[PDB]
Design a protein around this nucleic acid. Sequence first.
DNA 1: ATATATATATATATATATATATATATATATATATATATATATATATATATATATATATATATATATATATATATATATATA
DNA 2: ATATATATATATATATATATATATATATATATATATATATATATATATATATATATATATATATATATATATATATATATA
Lengths: 126, 126, 119, 119, 119
Amino acid sequence: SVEVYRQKIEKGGYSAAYEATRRYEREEIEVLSWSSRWESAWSKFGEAVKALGKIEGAPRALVIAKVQEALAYMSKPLPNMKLAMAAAVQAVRACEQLPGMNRERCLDAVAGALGVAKDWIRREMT
Amino acid sequence: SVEVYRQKIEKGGYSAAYEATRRYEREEIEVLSWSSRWESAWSKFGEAVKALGKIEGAPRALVIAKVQEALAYMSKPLPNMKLAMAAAVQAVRACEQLPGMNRERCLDAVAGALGVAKDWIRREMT
Amino acid sequence: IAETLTEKHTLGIEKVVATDSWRVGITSREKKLERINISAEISRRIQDEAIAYARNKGIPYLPGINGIAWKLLRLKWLGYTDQINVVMRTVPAEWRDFLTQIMENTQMESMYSELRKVR
Amino acid sequence: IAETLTEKHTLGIEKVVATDSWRVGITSREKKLERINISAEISRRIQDEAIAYARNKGIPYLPGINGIAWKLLRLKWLGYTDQINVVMRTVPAEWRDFLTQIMENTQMESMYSELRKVR
Amino acid sequence: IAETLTEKHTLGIEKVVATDSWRVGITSREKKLERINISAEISRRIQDEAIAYARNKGIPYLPGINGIAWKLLRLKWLGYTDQINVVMRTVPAEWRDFLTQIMENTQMESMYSELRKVR
DNA sequence: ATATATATATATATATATATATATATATATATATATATATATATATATATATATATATATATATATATATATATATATATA
DNA sequence: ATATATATATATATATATATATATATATATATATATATATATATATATATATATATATATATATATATATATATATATATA
């Protein structure tokens, strides 16, 4: 819709983001502590997605999302590897239908990204 | 409901949490005395609920809650181990139904978390 | 500067007293507040039968038997029954029949009110 | 001076509190906000069937089975069926019939609400 | 800085005089206050019997025997009868018949007045 | 002798505010565990559409302000035959 | 008629800068609309519990304050007979 578009335009985000950058270069803005809590937590999800680089073909968003969902379950204070393999086998099935990929080559990419053994995902695949 | 959602939005919690954060970094806010009373008392419930890590499977909120309920009675100024076992045998029965867990393995996790002997919970089980 | 769990609890309070979210958190709900009315009604009904039970059998009134009988009313609703069985051994002998009187013998009046309150 | 991803997150927040884009981001939509209404209804509907299931079979009420049954309702809409099959092995035995009761047996009322919410 | 029980008692008092919670704590009840009226009646009813008892038997009036007989009226209502028996040995001999007069012989007037007060 | 305000002994009931014991329910704000849905702002992955501001490639119209070539007309100020 | 500067009007073209309109694309920022997900923050809705605060409702009691009611007496003050 245009009416939801216009109300953000009249708030003037282009000029305000320019002054926020100039204030940073004149050292009047320091790093917020929300960002220090963000980059400390997110950084394990950033390099795990880059480890799926050798998957070729289709929209690979389902392989990326189900790997990010499976990694997040292992990062709880009480980790649940049962529900983590539930999201992992959805990534293996979504990967193997792409042109060029095998079942084991998608078992290579998923278990290498999550950093677990290949046999844990093969047991739940059936 | 949407109307109860809106009245907390107009109070502006996003900017107000941002200004209170910046006040902390410029040393205008010290640690409130309620927080020191909180962390001195809660800290036994945080590290003892992380001792339930090796229980796997289903929603484990019922084992988590009744172990936290069992620590509440032992931590009173007049501790009641009789009512504390009442919540402990409920956590053992709730842990037993999960796929993969045994009765003796749930007597391991519960009694190791509370820090008591295993035979106290087994006496009330019957 | 820092972000530990002590000063996270503090900075969450400071945003509450700044924008006044506690009082608008109560007055905007105003539908959940009638649970306070039903809870005061049940507790009066439990206390009155507790004193009548003390005079029918000639035992002294045991304070805090209201709270035990009110906990067992709510666990009977959820289904934590081995929670009940350890508590029934813990109370004395002449008060066990009062505790099952709240649960099943005054089921219909009292369990309906918890069925109304949680709804 | 610098442009890394820690400080890109900060300078985005700084322009938001400057131009007040959060509260005008919500109040200018006013159409998607009724999805909170429909989500509040399905959460009440799933939870009531979870308690009535616990009383017809005499099992205690297992908390967090509302959220498990709500995830499987949303994945059934998308088509992630081998996602479903592993979670059905993970829940205990007496509750597997409740989870397929939400998906298949309540496909009339509950699945139409998700069909109306994402629309 | 510090949180001990001495200054916890102080900081609760400081929040009372700040927001005036005492005088709004009394005026908002307005239904519990008729208990003062009924307590005024039983105090007058007990004291008039005490002087008539002192004049029928020729013994001097003993101050504080109206306060003693009021405690035995309420402990009889709860059921604390073994506490009743020791105070009956403690009161002198000519006044023991007055103490069982209040509990038993004017039960109907006085035990009802306690029974309406606590309700 | 009698009424009131204050402090103090003995023997008590009742109402309130506060702290403390024991046995509980309900609603609120904060932090934490588990199992979730929905809306917003921010950063990042994948596959895209549309609008704006800037920079750059290709191949062009049109209107301004400036500098330059060629071929001219007209108005002004200055210097010269 | 020439020359220096300032303006207008005809044309063909180049270059620097400011704008418009056609198109295919890249990049940096600002917004919108589709989707699956992660993380930080702001809120809503279901549940089980712990802890810190304020707030009702049942109960048995202690202690510090503020008031009421029934008695016997002392002391300080205030009034009456």
